[PDB]
Amino acid sequence: ENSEKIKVNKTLPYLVSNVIELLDVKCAVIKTSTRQTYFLPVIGLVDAEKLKPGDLVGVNKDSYLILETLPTEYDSRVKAMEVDERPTEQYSDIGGLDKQIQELVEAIVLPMNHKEKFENLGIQPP
Amino acid sequence: EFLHAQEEVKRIQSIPLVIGQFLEAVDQNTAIVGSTTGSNYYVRILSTIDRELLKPNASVALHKHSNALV
Amino acid sequence: PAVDTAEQVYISSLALLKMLKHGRAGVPMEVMGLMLGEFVDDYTVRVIDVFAMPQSGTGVSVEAVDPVFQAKMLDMLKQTGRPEMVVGWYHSHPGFGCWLSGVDINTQQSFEALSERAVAVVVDPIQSVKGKVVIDAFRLINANMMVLGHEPRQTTSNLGHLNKPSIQALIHGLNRHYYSITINYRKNELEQKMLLNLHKKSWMEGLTLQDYSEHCKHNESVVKEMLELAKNYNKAVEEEGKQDPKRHLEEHVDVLMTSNIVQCLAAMLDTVVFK
Amino acid sequence: LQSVGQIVGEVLKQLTEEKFIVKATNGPRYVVGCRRQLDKSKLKPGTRVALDMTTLTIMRYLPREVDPLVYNMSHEDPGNVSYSEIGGLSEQIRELR
Ligand SMILES: [Zn+2]
């Protein structure tokens, strides 16, 4: 019963908001997406150890208590910069550039692949 | 009854009150004020306020709900 | 048949106090609950007690009135000295005026389904800043019963037209879907003398002399204002905007006079009484 | 869940021992009073305080804002770099130290 009372009290228009430094008298300060700051006598349904400054929390649309912890969102353009299509041009499709191809591969792919050949030497990979 | 009424008049300008800036007066019982919310309003003046204090940039306090200059 | 404009909803002091307490606790969220009372007759409805509905995520909706909570609450109050019926439901509109939302109309319709006399009561907690108690009561207008059936409340007396509706309610639909009902606070003795104890001024403070240093400060400062004032009187009599003489002289003289008389008189009584 | 958040705001001139001018962060300027029991001397111009969002009365003067931008600007890993890893700058290291 207590959990379903929480559930009915967890309807989600959330006011996503940033966390600011926590206080003792364990309790949090919130800056809303509407650029107004609140203090919470108790943080809410999330635990203090999870939260941290500059976090994204979904709070109650009216009481502004924190009741959800959110994955950080950078920007729509930044996500648009991410490659999802994964293009297909092969290395064989590149002509004459074999030395440049080798340089780029050894600089980029090898640190991703192994990291053992570099660490066995102690060098910082490029 | 007049003591009661004057007590109510005093009770009008009790905290909380929103601060704003005084614009030029319109009539003896009203003036225009721009609240620190940013918005401007045409508001009745509380008759208890001494008029000489009303410089055209003075900081004043208005009723939180009715914006009444009090 | 029809209801009349002289219909009076009698709110006792205890129910009224519980209404403001629940409203001032629930803000910024609204709060709802069921009023306990009785329909004594057609021309008035009495409420004597009220209790709070636990808050939920449904807002103030028909969903919010919990059946098992209401049944348990009614049963427990029945075996404590109040087997009243639910005459209606109160409600809180924080900040916004005493109007009725569209979601606030269907719930009152559901309450009317139980009893046609079931009134809704809306209480603004924030706007009740001071001894101004901002509260109103509503009952639905049954569509056609106004559209073609015409005036929904018989005007048999002048008791219903002695109040002015609030423009906010007219914007939100007063006299079109719901009509207001005159509010009457049926207070009585043994309930007003108790409330006079919040500021009673016990005889302990009745016979104190305050502090002579502070009273000296008041007297001296008021005297400085007297002289600064009488300067303007001397300037102003010559005349042949807050005219200082009348207003400020009468106020300052009254205050100083009464303060000094009270202080000296209390000092004399304490001198003669305390050995 | 029953609890309700309080409004943060910087404070200004203390008009009397009870009436104060708070300024809610990115908000209006009010005149408000401390609740009943809080100290009044420490309530000086420049103290972050919480406001009850029904009467705006002062309660719970907070220490000061950290502004998580600044938190990131402090709790950032600088590395394990020691003076014995910087080379050829001995005079400049002496000056900086
Ligand atoms: Zn409503």
From Swiss-Prot, chain A:
Task: Give the protein's biological function.
Answer: Component of the 26S proteasome, a multiprotein complex involved in the ATP-dependent degradation of ubiquitinated proteins. This complex plays a key role in the maintenance of protein homeostasis by removing misfolded or damaged proteins, which could impair cellular functions, and by removing proteins whose functions are no longer required. Therefore, the proteasome participates in numerous cellular processes, including cell cycle progression, apoptosis, or DNA damage repair.
Question: Where would you find this protein in the cell?
Answer: Cytoplasm; Nucleus
Q: Which disease is it linked to?
A: Deafness, cataract, impaired intellectual development, and polyneuropathy: An autosomal recessive disease characterized by early onset of deafness, cataract, severe developmental delay, and severely impaired intellectual development. Patients later develop polyneuropathy of the lower extremities, associated with depigmentation of the hair in that area.
Q: How is it modified after translation?
A: Sumoylated by UBE2I in response to MEKK1-mediated stimuli.
Organism this protein belongs to: Homo sapiens
Family recorded in the similarity comment? Belongs to the AAA ATPase family.
The protein's name in its UniProt record: 26S proteasome regulatory subunit 6A
What is the covered span of the full protein?
A: 75 to 220 of 439
Curated annotation (Swiss-Prot), chain B:
Subcellular localization is given as: Cytoplasm; Nucleus
Oligomeric and partner information: Component of the 19S proteasome regulatory particle complex. The 26S proteasome consists of a 20S core particle (CP) and two 19S regulatory subunits (RP). The regulatory particle is made of a lid composed of 9 subunits, a base containing 6 ATPases including PSMC4 and few additional components. Interacts with NR1I3. Interacts with PAAF1. Interacts with TRIM5. Interacts with ZFAND1.
Task of the protein: Component of the 26S proteasome, a multiprotein complex involved in the ATP-dependent degradation of ubiquitinated proteins. This complex plays a key role in the maintenance of protein homeostasis by removing misfolded or damaged proteins, which could impair cellular functions, and by removing proteins whose functions are no longer required. Therefore, the proteasome participates in numerous cellular processes, including cell cycle progression, apoptosis, or DNA damage repair.
What family is it from? Belongs to the AAA ATPase family.
Protein's name in the database: 26S proteasome regulatory subunit 6B
Q: What is the species listed in this Swiss-Prot or TrEMBL entry? A: Homo sapiens (Human)
Portion of the full sequence shown: 71 to 140 of 418
Swiss-Prot record, chain C:
Where along the chain is Zn(2+) bound? H91, H93, D104
Q: Which residues carry this modification: Phosphoserine?
A: S128, S202
Q: Where is the MPN domain?
A: 9-144
Q: Name one Pfam family in it.
A: RPN11_C
This entry's Gene Ontology molecular function terms read: endopeptidase activator activity; K63-linked deubiquitinase activity; metal ion binding; metal-dependent deubiquitinase activity; metallopeptidase activity; proteasome binding
Matching entries from SUPFAM superfamilies are given as: JAB1/MPN domain
Which InterPro entries does the UniProt record give? JAMM/MPN+_dom (IPR000555), JAMM_MPN+_peptidase_M67A (IPR050242), MPN (IPR037518), RPN11_C (IPR056263)
Q: Which tissues is it found in, per the record?
A: Widely expressed. Highest levels in heart and skeletal muscle.
List, alphabetically, the GO terms of the cellular component aspect. Answer: cytosol; cytosolic proteasome complex; extracellular region; ficolin-1-rich granule lumen; nucleoplasm; nucleus; proteasome accessory complex; proteasome complex
Motif annotated as JAMM motif, chain positions: 91-104
Read off the PROSITE patterns from this record.
Answer: MPN (PS50249)
What UniProt keywords apply to this chain's record, in alphabetical order? Answer: DNA damage, DNA repair, Hydrolase, Metal-binding, Metalloprotease, Phosphoprotein, Protease, Proteasome, Ubl conjugation pathway, Zinc
Q: What is its EC number?
A: 3.4.19.-
Q: Name one GO biological process term.
A: proteasome-mediated ubiquitin-dependent protein catabolic process
Please give the subunit comment from the record.
Component of the 19S proteasome regulatory particle complex. The 26S proteasome consists of a 20S core particle (CP) and two 19S regulatory subunits (RP). The regulatory particle is made of a lid composed of 9 subunits including PSMD4, a base containing 6 ATPases and few additional components. Within the complex, PSMD4 interacts with subunit PSMD7 through their respective MPN domain. Interacts with TXNL1.
Protein family membership: Belongs to the peptidase M67A family. PSMD14 subfamily.
UniProtKB/Swiss-Prot annotation, chain D:
N6-acetyllysine: which positions carry it? K23
Source organism phylogeny? Eukaryota, Metazoa, Chordata, Craniata, Vertebrata
The gene name reads PSMC6
Q: Which family does it belong to?
A: Belongs to the AAA ATPase family.
Q: Which residues of the full protein are shown?
A: 50 to 146 of 389
Subunit structure comment from the entry: Component of the 19S proteasome regulatory particle complex. The 26S proteasome consists of a 20S core particle (CP) and two 19S regulatory subunits (RP). The regulatory particle is made of a lid composed of 9 subunits, a base containing 6 ATPases including PSMC6 and few additional components. Interacts with PAAF1.
Residue span of the signal peptide, if any? none
Q: Its domain of life?
A: Eukaryota
What is the species listed in this Swiss-Prot or TrEMBL entry? Homo sapiens
Q: What does this protein do?
A: Component of the 26S proteasome, a multiprotein complex involved in the ATP-dependent degradation of ubiquitinated proteins. This complex plays a key role in the maintenance of protein homeostasis by removing misfolded or damaged proteins, which could impair cellular functions, and by removing proteins whose functions are no longer required. Therefore, the proteasome participates in numerous cellular processes, including cell cycle progression, apoptosis, or DNA damage repair.
Q: What is this protein called?
A: 26S proteasome regulatory subunit 10B
Annotated compartments? Cytoplasm; Nucleus
List all disulphide bridges recorded for this chain.
Answer: none
